[PDB]
Design an enzyme around this catalytic site. Structure first.
Site, PDB file in Angstrom:
ATOM      1  N   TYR A   1      14.992  31.539  30.320  1.00 20.50           N
ATOM      2  CA  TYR A   1      15.027  31.977  28.936  1.00 20.50           C
ATOM      3  C   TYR A   1      15.880  33.210  28.774  1.00 20.50           C
ATOM      4  O   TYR A   1      16.598  33.327  27.763  1.00 20.50           O
ATOM      5  CB  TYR A   1      13.589  32.158  28.374  1.00 20.50           C
ATOM      6  CG  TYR A   1      12.920  33.482  28.683  1.00 20.50           C
ATOM      7  CD1 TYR A   1      12.242  33.699  29.879  1.00 20.50           C
ATOM      8  CD2 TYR A   1      12.962  34.523  27.766  1.00 20.50           C
ATOM      9  CE1 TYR A   1      11.620  34.945  30.149  1.00 20.50           C
ATOM     10  CE2 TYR A   1      12.335  35.742  28.012  1.00 20.50           C
ATOM     11  CZ  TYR A   1      11.664  35.948  29.203  1.00 20.50           C
ATOM     12  OH  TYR A   1      11.072  37.174  29.433  1.00 20.50           O
TER      13      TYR A   1
ATOM     14  N   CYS B   1      11.945  42.282  24.674  1.00 19.91           N
ATOM     15  CA  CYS B   1      11.823  41.442  23.484  1.00 19.91           C
ATOM     16  C   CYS B   1      12.415  42.094  22.244  1.00 19.91           C
ATOM     17  O   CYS B   1      13.067  41.411  21.428  1.00 19.91           O
ATOM     18  CB  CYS B   1      10.344  41.114  23.154  1.00 19.91           C
ATOM     19  SG  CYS B   1       9.054  41.416  24.412  1.00 19.91           S
TER      20      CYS B   1
ATOM     21  N   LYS C   1      16.380  42.569  22.509  1.00 21.46           N
ATOM     22  CA  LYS C   1      16.829  41.200  22.625  1.00 21.46           C
ATOM     23  C   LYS C   1      16.874  40.525  21.219  1.00 21.46           C
ATOM     24  O   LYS C   1      17.850  39.856  20.838  1.00 21.46           O
ATOM     25  CB  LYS C   1      15.825  40.454  23.557  1.00 21.46           C
ATOM     26  CG  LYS C   1      16.029  39.000  23.735  1.00 21.46           C
ATOM     27  CD  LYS C   1      15.396  38.103  22.660  1.00 21.46           C
ATOM     28  CE  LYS C   1      13.925  37.896  22.872  1.00 21.46           C
ATOM     29  NZ  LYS C   1      13.444  37.402  24.223  1.00 21.46           N
TER      30      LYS C   1
ATOM     31  N   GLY D   1      19.631  30.215  34.349  1.00 21.52           N
ATOM     32  CA  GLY D   1      19.397  29.378  33.177  1.00 21.52           C
ATOM     33  C   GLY D   1      17.946  29.298  32.712  1.00 21.52           C
ATOM     34  O   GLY D   1      17.545  28.317  32.076  1.00 21.52           O
TER      35      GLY D   1
ATOM     36  N   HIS E   1       7.451  20.570  -0.703  1.00 26.51           N
ATOM     37  CA  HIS E   1       8.816  20.065  -0.854  1.00 26.51           C
ATOM     38  C   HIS E   1       9.611  21.051  -1.720  1.00 26.51           C
ATOM     39  O   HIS E   1       9.095  21.524  -2.731  1.00 26.51           O
ATOM     40  CB  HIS E   1       8.782  18.678  -1.534  1.00 26.51           C
ATOM     41  CG  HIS E   1      10.111  17.977  -1.611  1.00 26.51           C
ATOM     42  ND1 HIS E   1      10.820  17.609  -0.481  1.00 26.51           N
ATOM     43  CD2 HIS E   1      10.817  17.510  -2.666  1.00 26.51           C
ATOM     44  CE1 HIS E   1      11.925  16.980  -0.847  1.00 26.51           C
ATOM     45  NE2 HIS E   1      11.949  16.903  -2.170  1.00 26.51           N
TER      46      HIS E   1
ATOM     47  N   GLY F   1       0.599  46.250  27.963  1.00 23.84           N
ATOM     48  CA  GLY F   1      -0.790  46.215  28.367  1.00 23.84           C
ATOM     49  C   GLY F   1      -1.383  47.608  28.542  1.00 23.84           C
ATOM     50  O   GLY F   1      -2.445  47.896  27.998  1.00 23.84           O
TER      51      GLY F   1
ATOM     52  N   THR G   1       8.550  47.528  28.819  1.00 26.45           N
ATOM     53  CA  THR G   1       9.726  46.710  28.984  1.00 26.45           C
ATOM     54  C   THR G   1      10.133  46.031  27.682  1.00 26.45           C
ATOM     55  O   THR G   1      11.322  45.960  27.352  1.00 26.45           O
ATOM     56  CB  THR G   1       9.524  45.685  30.112  1.00 26.45           C
ATOM     57  OG1 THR G   1       9.320  46.420  31.326  1.00 26.45           O
ATOM     58  CG2 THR G   1      10.776  44.773  30.244  1.00 26.45           C
ATOM     59  N   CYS G   2       9.152  45.533  26.960  1.00 24.48           N
ATOM     60  CA  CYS G   2       9.412  44.757  25.757  1.00 24.48           C
ATOM     61  C   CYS G   2      10.020  45.660  24.663  1.00 24.48           C
ATOM     62  O   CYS G   2      11.051  45.309  24.088  1.00 24.48           O
ATOM     63  CB  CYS G   2       8.142  44.130  25.252  1.00 24.48           C
ATOM     64  SG  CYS G   2       8.364  43.205  23.726  1.00 24.48           S
TER      65      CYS G   2
ATOM     66  N   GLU H   1       7.762  20.120   6.179  1.00 25.30           N
ATOM     67  CA  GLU H   1       7.084  18.937   5.649  1.00 25.30           C
ATOM     68  C   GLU H   1       7.279  17.694   6.523  1.00 25.30           C
ATOM     69  O   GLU H   1       6.452  16.771   6.463  1.00 25.30           O
ATOM     70  CB  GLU H   1       7.471  18.624   4.201  1.00 25.30           C
ATOM     71  CG  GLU H   1       8.937  18.377   3.950  1.00 25.30           C
ATOM     72  CD  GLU H   1       9.228  17.980   2.527  1.00 25.30           C
ATOM     73  OE1 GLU H   1      10.224  18.459   1.972  1.00 25.30           O
ATOM     74  OE2 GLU H   1       8.483  17.141   1.962  1.00 25.30           O
TER      75      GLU H   1
ATOM     76  N   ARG I   1      14.189  24.881  33.127  1.00 27.88           N
ATOM     77  CA  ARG I   1      13.237  24.155  33.943  1.00 27.88           C
ATOM     78  C   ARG I   1      11.832  24.435  33.373  1.00 27.88           C
ATOM     79  O   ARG I   1      11.581  25.536  32.941  1.00 27.88           O
ATOM     80  CB  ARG I   1      13.281  24.730  35.365  1.00 27.88           C
ATOM     81  CG  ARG I   1      13.456  23.745  36.469  1.00 27.88           C
ATOM     82  CD  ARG I   1      13.341  24.444  37.829  1.00 27.88           C
ATOM     83  NE  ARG I   1      14.469  25.341  38.154  1.00 27.88           N
ATOM     84  CZ  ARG I   1      15.490  25.049  38.984  1.00 27.88           C
ATOM     85  NH1 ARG I   1      15.603  23.853  39.562  1.00 27.88           N
ATOM     86  NH2 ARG I   1      16.421  25.971  39.244  1.00 27.88           N
TER      87      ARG I   1
ATOM     88  N   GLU J   1       3.796  57.252  32.950  1.00 27.57           N
ATOM     89  CA  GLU J   1       4.995  56.457  32.629  1.00 27.57           C
ATOM     90  C   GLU J   1       6.223  57.068  33.267  1.00 27.57           C
ATOM     91  O   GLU J   1       6.606  58.218  32.963  1.00 27.57           O
ATOM     92  CB  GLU J   1       5.198  56.381  31.117  1.00 27.57           C
ATOM     93  CG  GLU J   1       6.416  55.578  30.678  1.00 27.57           C
ATOM     94  CD  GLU J   1       6.545  54.236  31.385  1.00 27.57           C
ATOM     95  OE1 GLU J   1       5.640  53.375  31.240  1.00 27.57           O
ATOM     96  OE2 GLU J   1       7.564  54.054  32.052  1.00 27.57           O
TER      97      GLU J   1
ATOM     98  N   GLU K   1      19.261  33.081  26.390  1.00 27.78           N
ATOM     99  CA  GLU K   1      19.227  33.947  25.200  1.00 27.78           C
ATOM    100  C   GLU K   1      20.495  34.803  25.159  1.00 27.78           C
ATOM    101  O   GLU K   1      21.125  34.901  24.133  1.00 27.78           O
ATOM    102  CB  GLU K   1      17.978  34.804  25.161  1.00 27.78           C
ATOM    103  CG  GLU K   1      16.742  34.007  24.710  1.00 27.78           C
ATOM    104  CD  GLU K   1      15.434  34.746  24.830  1.00 27.78           C
ATOM    105  OE1 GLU K   1      15.365  35.798  25.503  1.00 27.78           O
ATOM    106  OE2 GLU K   1      14.431  34.278  24.265  1.00 27.78           O
TER     107      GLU K   1
ATOM    108  N   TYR L   1       4.477  54.693  19.656  1.00 25.51           N
ATOM    109  CA  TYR L   1       3.583  54.473  20.802  1.00 25.51           C
ATOM    110  C   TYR L   1       3.048  55.762  21.417  1.00 25.51           C
ATOM    111  O   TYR L   1       1.838  55.900  21.686  1.00 25.51           O
ATOM    112  CB  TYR L   1       4.211  53.597  21.854  1.00 25.51           C
ATOM    113  CG  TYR L   1       4.220  52.138  21.455  1.00 25.51           C
ATOM    114  CD1 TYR L   1       5.367  51.533  20.992  1.00 25.51           C
ATOM    115  CD2 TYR L   1       3.055  51.362  21.522  1.00 25.51           C
ATOM    116  CE1 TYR L   1       5.384  50.174  20.618  1.00 25.51           C
ATOM    117  CE2 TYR L   1       3.052  49.998  21.130  1.00 25.51           C
ATOM    118  CZ  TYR L   1       4.238  49.425  20.674  1.00 25.51           C
ATOM    119  OH  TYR L   1       4.281  48.084  20.290  1.00 25.51           O
TER     120      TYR L   1
END
Ligand SMILES: Cc1cc2nc3c(=O)[nH]c(=O)nc-3n(C[C@H](O)[C@H](O)[C@H](O)COP(=O)(O)OP(=O)(O)OC[C@H]3O[C@@H](n4cnc5c(N)ncnc54)[C@H](O)[C@@H]3O)c2cc1C
Ligand SMILES: Cc1cc2nc3c(=O)[nH]c(=O)nc-3n(C[C@H](O)[C@H](O)[C@H](O)COP(=O)(O)OP(=O)(O)OC[C@H]3O[C@@H](n4cnc5c(N)ncnc54)[C@H](O)[C@@H]3O)c2cc1C
Ligand SMILES: [Cl-]
Ligand SMILES: [Cl-]
Ligand SMILES: [Cl-]
Ligand SMILES: [Cl-]
Lengths: 459, 455
Positions: free
Chosen positions: A177, A46, A49, A175, A435, A14, A40-41, A440, A204, A33, A181, A97
Site C-alpha cells: 500500500y 497517514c 500521505k 508494491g 438517486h 496508541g 508516525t501517522c 445506490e 498481495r 518521545e 500510494e 497532541y
C-alpha cells in the site's frame, strides 16, 4: 515508591491516547518521545500521505471540468509550497497532541527511553533514570533494514515528504500500500514513475479484482510496473541513481524510494532487561488484556505485531486503559477491520476476498459491478467504479465488500458498519436507493453475477 | 378481447419500469409518452440537475487547489458548452430507455393518452382508440399554477436551457429544488437571491441541516430573504422586478419559480375512467397501488406520495407483482439534497425522535475536513446520529458536507437493518476518512429524557 504510576514509551497513535486518558484519570504519568509528539501517522504517515494524495489529484480533476464547460490554463504545481503547507499542518497537529498530554498533567520527556530493569527507564539524552509502577510499550514499527548494495542511497517514507525538489523521475521499490500510494502521488504531480515489485501483481492479500484493476489503471496512465523484480544494487551516477535488478535490467531515476515493509520496533529497547517476551517476528507478545508476560508491563499498537493501522493502535490504547485501571476486561477486536488504500484509483475493503470466501464457505454468491459514474460520462474520463459484495449463500450474510474508485475508502468504512452487524444481502436489497448517487448500485444488485458451490463457479 | 393486457400512461421512472417488467413477462404491453421517453428525472430533473451541480462544483476545486501548491489556472466557465453536453447525455439516456422498452416488446405510442372510458384510451396525435385489460397511470407531477407576471418566470422545465448565464437570478421557493438551483447558479458566478415564504429553508428536514445550510449559503454571498411572498413580477427595461407583499423589490435578469410540484392529471380524462382524485390532485391508491377502479393502478408522483425516482421505481415493482405475479415500503427512505454543502438524511430528525422516545441520545459532530484546513476553505462536515436510548437502535442519521448523499445512502443500509449504536461503535475506523467520525462517537453530545434536554 515509584516516580510515576505509568510511564509510556512512545507518543504515537496508541501511546498518546493511553497517556492522556490515564492522566485524566488522575494518575501520575510520563511519556517519552524520541522524535516528534503524535507519532508516525501524524508526522510522517497517514496525515501527510493523505495531503500529498489530495495535492496529486487536482490535475486529473481539472481535466474532468472540460466536459462540463470549463477551460483553464495549463496547470503548474509548486512542490516547495506543498511541503511548506504540510509542515504547517503537521506542526499544528503536533502542538495539539502535546497540549492534550499536558492538559492531563502528563510529563513529556523529549528523549528516547530504554529499560534498565523491570521498573526503571533510562533517558538516552541525559542518562536520567525514572521509575514507574506500570510501563506501556508503544514504540511502533520501523522500516526493515534493506542491508541491497547502496540501500543507504535510497529514501524511505521517513524522507519522502521533505525532498528539496520534485524529482524528474522516481523508482519506488515495493508494491504494498505504501508503494502504490506514493507511485500514484508522484505520477499525478508529473513525475516519471516506475514501481518495482518482487511478485506477480501489486497488493498481495487484497481481493484479486482490486489488485488487477489498480494495476491496469496505473499502467494505462503511464506508470511503469516491473514485476518479478529484485533490486541487486543502487549506484550513484551524476544524473541519476542507477537501479540494477537481479535479472540485468537497469532503471536510472532521480530518486529511489524503498517501501519494502515495517517491523515492530523492539531492538535496542532493553526488553531483555525487563524480561519482556518478543517473538520471532520482533513483536512484543501480549495477551487479551494487552499485558506482556511481565504483569506491570503492557504494549499497544504496531509493536505488538498485529496489522499496522492507526485506528487499531487507538483501539488497543482504549483496551489498555480499561484493563489496567478497571475491573472490566475490554478485549481487543481485530475482526472485520475495514482498510483503505489511497491509491488512484482509491481502494476500500472489508472482510473476505472472493478467493478466501470460496474456500471458507460451501456456497458463495458474488455481486459484482463495474460502471462509469455519471460525472465521467460528460468528462470523457476512463475512470470506473468497481463494487463487489461477497455473500455466504447459506446464511445470506455479506462476508466481504470491495470497492475501487472515487472515495472507495469512505464507502468501505460505511459498508463496514453493515458487515460488523452481519446484515444479510436481503437487507441491502430492501434499502431504498438515493438517486442519483454511486452508492445506490449497492442496494440494487438483486441478482448474483455468479455463484460458487464447493469452490467451483457455476456456469 | 382487449388490444393490450396493459397500457401504461407515462414513460418516466415508474411507467418505464412497469412496462419493461410486464413486457418481459410475456404480456402484451403498450406505453404512451406525450413528451420524451424516460420522463422527468432523465430529461429535466435529477439527471441534468446533478450534471449542473457537478459543473458548479468545479469552481471550488480550482480555488481549493491553490493551497496545495497549484498556481491559479484562470478557470473560465461557458454555459453554452454545458447545455450542449447535457443535451447529448439526456438524448443518450432517452434512447437507452427506448431500447429497454423495445427489448421488452413494449409497443410505444408517441402521443398523449386520454381515457375515453374505463378500458379505452384515445391517442391525441392520431385519434386512435386502444383498449386495455389493465391500465397504469404513471403521469408524474407538474409545476403548480402559481402571482401576476408569473408567465414571465422560468421553472425547472426551462431552467436548463437558458440561452446564456444570467448576471443575476431570483429563485422563488426554499424547498430542495430552490436551494439546489440557488447553489448551482451562485457557484457559476450568478448574483443569487432566494426567496422563501417561511422562516427557514427546507421545511421537514432536521433543524441542523436546515440551519447549517442556511448559514453556509448566506456566508458565501447568496441572499436569502425570509417571510417573502411574491406579489408580482414586472418586466422593466433592464431586468425583472420582483415585488414582494412586504413592499421590498428585487430586480434580476431572470426569475425562477421553485414553488412545489403537484400530481399531473392534465389532459388525462380521468373523469371517464371513474378514478377518484383527492383535494391535492392525487390519484388515490391503496396499499397495492390500486385506484378505486379495480383494473386501474397508479405509481409514482401522481399518487401524491414523496416525489423521488427510487420510490416511483419501487411502486412499479410492487404494481407488477400484485398485477401479474406486496405493499410498498416507505419506511426509512434516505433522501439527498444536492445543495452546496450537500445534505443526506435518513430516518427521524432530532425533534421527531425526542417526542417518540423516552430517552434519545444525540451524537453530533461538526469539524473541518483536513483538506479544507490546508486549502483555507470554510466548508464543514456535520454528522449526527439520533439513537433510542432504550433499544440502542440508531433511528436517524443526518449528514451535511461533501458527498453527504453517498454517505447517507450507505448509513441507510445499517438503519434498515436496525443496527444499534453499539454496532457502529464496535466498527473499526478507517483513517484518514470523514466517515470514521461515525464509528468513534462513544459519548453522547447530549441526551433528552422525557422530551427535555439534560444538563
Ligand atoms: C507512510 C505511512 C503511511 C501510513 N498510512 C496509514 C493510513 O493511511 N492509515 C492507517 O490506519 N495507518 C497508516 N499508517 C500506519 C500508522 O502510522 C501506524 O499503524 C500507527 O502510527 C501506529 O501507532 P503506534 O502508536 O503503534 O506507533 P507510532 O505512531 O509509530 O508511535 C511510536 C512512537 O514512539 C517513538 N519511539 C519509538 N521508540 C522510542 C523509544 N524507545 N523512546 C521514545 N520514543 C520512542 C517514535 O518516535 C514514535 O513517535 C501509515 C504508516 C506509514 C509509515
Ligand atoms: C428539477 C427536479 C429535480 C429532481 N431531482 C431528483 C433527485 O435528485 N432525486 C430523485 O429521486 N428525484 C428527483 N426528482 C423527482 C423525480 O424526477 C420524480 O420523482 C420522478 O421522475 C417521478 O417519476 P414518475 O414515474 O412518477 O413520473 P415522471 O418521471 O414525471 O414521468 C411522467 C411521464 O408522463 C408523461 N405524461 C404525463 N401525462 C401523460 C399523458 N396523459 N399521456 C402520455 N404521457 C404523459 C410525462 O411527459 C412524463 O414523461 C426531481 C424532480 C425535478 C422536477
Ligand atoms: Cl489521542
Ligand atoms: Cl480474490
Ligand atoms: Cl427501467
Ligand atoms: Cl430536528
Amino acid at each position: 515508591s515509584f516516580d510515576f504510576d505509568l510511564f509510556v514509551i512512545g507518543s504515537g497513535s496508541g501511546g498518546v491516547r493511553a497517556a492522556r486518558l490515564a492522566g485524566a484519570l488522575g494518575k501520575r504519568v510520563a511519556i517519552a518521545e524520541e522524535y516528534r509528539i503524535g507519532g508516525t501517522c501524524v508526522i510522517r504517515g497517514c496525515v501527510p500521505k493523505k495531503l500529498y494524495f489530495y495535492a496529486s489529484q487536482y490535475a486529473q480533476e481539472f481535466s474532468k471540468s472540460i466536459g462540463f464547460g470549463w477551460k483553464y490554463a495549463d496547470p503548474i504545481f509548486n512542490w516547495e509550497k506543498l511541503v511548506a503547507a504540510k509542515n504547517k499542518e503537521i506542526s499544528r497537529l503536533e502542538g495539539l497532541y502535546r497540549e492534550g498530554l499536558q492538559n492531563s498533567n502528563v510529563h513529556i520527556y523529549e528523549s528516547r527511553a530504554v529499560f534498565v530493569d523491570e521498573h526503571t527507564l533510562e533517558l538516552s539524552v541525559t542518562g536520567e533514570r525514572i521509575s514507574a509502577e506500570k510501563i506501556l510499550i508503544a514504540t511502533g514499527a520501523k522500516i526493515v533494514s534493506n542491508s541491497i548494495k547502496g540501500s543507504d542511497l535510497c529514501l524511505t517514507s521517513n524522507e519522502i515528504f521533505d525532498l528539496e525538489k520534485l524529482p524528474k523521475s522516481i523508482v519506488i521499490v515495493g508494491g504494498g500500500y505504501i508503494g502504490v500510494e506514493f507511485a500514484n502521488i508522484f505520477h499525478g504531480l508529473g513525475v516519471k514513475t516506475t514501481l518495482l515489485h518482487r511478485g506477480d501483481l501489486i497488493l498481495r492479500n487484497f481481493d484479486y479484482d482490486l489488485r488487477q484493476l489498480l494495476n491496469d489503471a496505473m499502467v494505462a496512465k503511464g506508470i511503469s510496473i516491473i514485476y518479478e523484480a529484485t533490486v541487486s544494487q543502487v549506484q550513484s551516477t551524476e544524473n541519476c541513481y542507477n537501479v540494477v535488478l537481479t535479472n540485468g535490467q537497469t532503471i536510472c531515476a532521480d530518486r529511489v524510494m524503498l517501501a519494502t515493509g515495517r517491523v515492530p520496533n523492539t531492538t535496542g529497547l532493553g526488553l531483555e532487561r525487563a524480561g519482556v517476551k518478543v517473538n520471532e517476528f520482533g513483536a512484543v507478545v501480549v495477551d487479551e488484556k494487552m499485558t506482556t508476560n511481565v504483569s506491570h508491563i503492557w504494549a499497544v499498537g504496531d509493536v505488538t505485531g498485529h496489522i499496522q493501522l492507526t485506528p487499531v493502535a487507538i483501539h488497543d490504547a482504549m483496551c489498555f486503559v480499561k484493563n489496567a485501571f478497571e475491573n472490566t476486561s475490554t478485549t481487543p477486536d481485530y475482526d472485520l477491520i475495514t482498510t483503505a488504500v489511497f491509491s488512484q484509483p482509491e481502494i476500500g475493503t472489508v472482510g473476505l476476498s472472493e478467493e478466501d470466501a470460496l474456500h471458507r464457505y460451501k456456497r458463495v454468491e458474488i455481486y459484482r459491478t463495474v460502471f462509469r459514474p455519471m460525472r465521467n460520462v460528460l468528462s470523457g474520463s476512463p475512470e470506473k467504479m468497481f463494487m463487489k459484495l461477497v455473500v455466504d449463500g447459506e446464511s445470506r450474510i455479506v462476508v466481504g465488500a470491495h470497492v475501487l474508485g472515487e472515495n472507495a475508502g469512505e464507502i468501505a468504512q460505511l459498508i463496514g458498519i453493515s458487515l460488523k452487524g452481519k446484515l444479510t444481502k436481503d437487507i441491502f436489497d430492501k434499502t431504498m436507493a438515493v438517486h442519483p448517487t454511486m452508492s445506490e448500485e449497492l442496494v440494487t444488485m438483486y441478482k448474483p453475477s455468479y455463484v460458487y458451490e464447493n469452490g467451483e463457479k457455476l456456469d
